Amino acid sequence: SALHWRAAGAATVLLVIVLLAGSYLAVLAERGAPGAQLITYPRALWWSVETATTVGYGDLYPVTLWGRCVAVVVMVAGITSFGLVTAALATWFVGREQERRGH
Amino acid sequence: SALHWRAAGAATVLLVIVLLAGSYLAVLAERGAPGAQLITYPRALWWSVETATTVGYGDLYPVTLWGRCVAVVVMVAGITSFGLVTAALATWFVGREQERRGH
Amino acid sequence: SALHWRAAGAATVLLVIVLLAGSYLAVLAERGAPGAQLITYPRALWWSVETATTVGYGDLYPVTLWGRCVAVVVMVAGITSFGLVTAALATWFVGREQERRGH
Amino acid sequence: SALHWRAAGAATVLLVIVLLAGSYLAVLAERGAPGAQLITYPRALWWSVETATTVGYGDLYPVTLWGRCVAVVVMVAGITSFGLVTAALATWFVGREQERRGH
Amino acid sequence: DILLTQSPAILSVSPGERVSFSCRASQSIGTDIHWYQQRTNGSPRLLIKYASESISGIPSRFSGSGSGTDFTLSINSVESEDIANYYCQQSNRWPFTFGSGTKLEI
Amino acid sequence: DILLTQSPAILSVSPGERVSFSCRASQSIGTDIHWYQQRTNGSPRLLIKYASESISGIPSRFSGSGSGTDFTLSINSVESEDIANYYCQQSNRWPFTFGSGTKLEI
Ligand SMILES: CC[As+](CC)(CC)CC
Ligand SMILES: [Co+2]
Ligand SMILES: [Tl+]
Ligand SMILES: [Tl+]
Ligand SMILES: [Tl+]
Ligand SMILES: [Tl+]
């Protein structure tokens, strides 16, 4: 083990769960709002990933309050996750560089 | 305490303030510009978050000079904040890894 | 050498490959789906970069399942890569700061 | 001084230059392409920032080859810059945490 | 600016019948339409908001529907107290605009 | 809400000929159109989904095409068992809406 790598794993699992519950809850929240486009499950999972990577194109987006809530949670999950890998990569690199220098 | 975690907290509080003043000022700046879409408070707060996470979909965006100024401030707040957590996560991980190694 | 810089290089090479195979496979997957816009090679490479930087504008995006798969791979490649440079930059800075302090 | 903070400064200056030359060259490249929307200076600077923060909404985007080249340069400048601050923030935090621990 | 088009300008209905007023946008505005009522000599009276959300204090027989460019205010069982002018209003894009109005007549 | 427009309402064809039913959307809906069949006294019967994806259990002579706003269900060689009403349905934007229907007649 090692904490940093253990958090990355955790964060991935978590992410995969967040952006599934995400899809489900997005559809659940968005159906009922006239004109809402984010209303079938499959494409709504693709919206989840898209959103979590902050690449948001605008083919799909939530229009209701709770959709947008779910949205916000997905975004932060996406960022937190991906940042917590970058952090974990530095931790690793920094550990190694100290060996190269004999520290 | 610990500086890194104290800055993260700070940055969150700050962010929440930036993307509220953001919404308010966005509406204030955008009303008066014909065709502007970013002109009610609630949705304009959703624009704030969206923007700060860099996920910008394009359901909403500022069209005036000052809207776009406010926009720029929100973006940087969003990024700074989220980066300052990633930094804080590495700081933490790096602190820990040194214990595992008995350093 | 030095690991951190060696990973950055690696990650760049990898990225350049991912977002070429990306373009190719995107076109391959998207042609055949009525209304699909992501169907010529040149612009589809521009879609690749756009996507990998998470700047996704929405001039172009995949509409099929496999397009979106390819998409997901490109995004993660883009992020992983760019994060693995930030990590490598900290590793470097952190190495240096310790010299300034005579550590 | 301190390297990490000196690079952040540098990167900011650089960024400000990249996303000005960016605007200028974007207009220069895009005028002449029928239907191109990215063709006046002011809004094209707003496109620059938007793009560099990866928040790309899709109110504006390059359509020509060289526009898209310029685009790619702006994106990478934006990311590199903002990552090089996050790196610099960790470097700082990590320096400090070691004092708290008396290292 | 957004042009709202209320047709027909007059609506003649027998008491109790179901009635429907139309409002059309010059371009897609989502659900940012709002309905007001104005009785002779009276001020406007918010009836329905965002096309279908009801307002507290308004008869249950008032409802609304639509999205994008075509929107409809309905009254299930019409009656004397409904005789009024009916305007719709959009808040999608700036200026903020009203419909020409239509008059209900029993 | 999305308006689906099936014209013409009736289709008269000689046995075996190729036949084509039209369905038009009030606004671009991609390929989120679906085709149902209803024989006299019968329940609807999913024929084609997302405009062109075939359904297991449906004659090979059934096909479909189109994208955006204009969509078409076709039958290569028509025959008695095809005499029915044909409806299309969209799942692009919420409400979910049907077409007025068209009747095939040999
Ligand atoms: C303004 C972004 As778009 C409409 C949401 C993305 C499909 C048009 C480029
Ligand atoms: Co030491
Ligand atoms: Tl982004
Ligand atoms: Tl983005
Ligand atoms: Tl976008
Ligand atoms: Tl980032």
From Swiss-Prot, chains A, B, C, D:
Q: Which residues form a coiled coil?
A: none
Indicate whether Ribosomal protein appears among the record's keywords. Answer: no
Question: Which residues face the membrane's Extracellular side?
Answer: 30-40, 60-66
Changes seen on gene knockout: Cells grow slower and to lower myceliar densities.
List every range the entry marks intramembrane.
Answer: 41-51, 52-59
Keywords recorded for this protein, A-Z: Cell membrane, Ion channel, Ion transport, Ligand-gated ion channel, Membrane, Transmembrane, Transmembrane helix, Transport
Subcellular location field: Cell membrane
Keyword presence, Transmembrane helix: yes
MF-aspect GO terms: identical protein binding; voltage-gated potassium channel activity
Q: Where are the transmembrane segments?
A: 7-29, 67-90
The cysteines covalently paired via disulfide bonds are none
The UniProt entry lists membrane topology as: Multi-pass membrane protein
Top-level taxon of origin: Bacteria
Give the motif span (Selectivity filter).
54-59
What processes in GO biological process is this protein linked to?
Answer: action potential
How does the entry describe the domains? The cytoplasmic C-terminus is involved in the gating mechanism.
Q: How does it assemble?
A: Homotetramer.
Note in the entry:
The amino acids 62-79 are situated in the membrane and are important for channel structure and properties.
The protein's name: pH-gated potassium channel KcsA
Q: Which organism is it from?
A: Streptomyces lividans
Q: Which gene encodes it?
A: kcsA
Give the shown range, full length included.
22 to 124 of 160
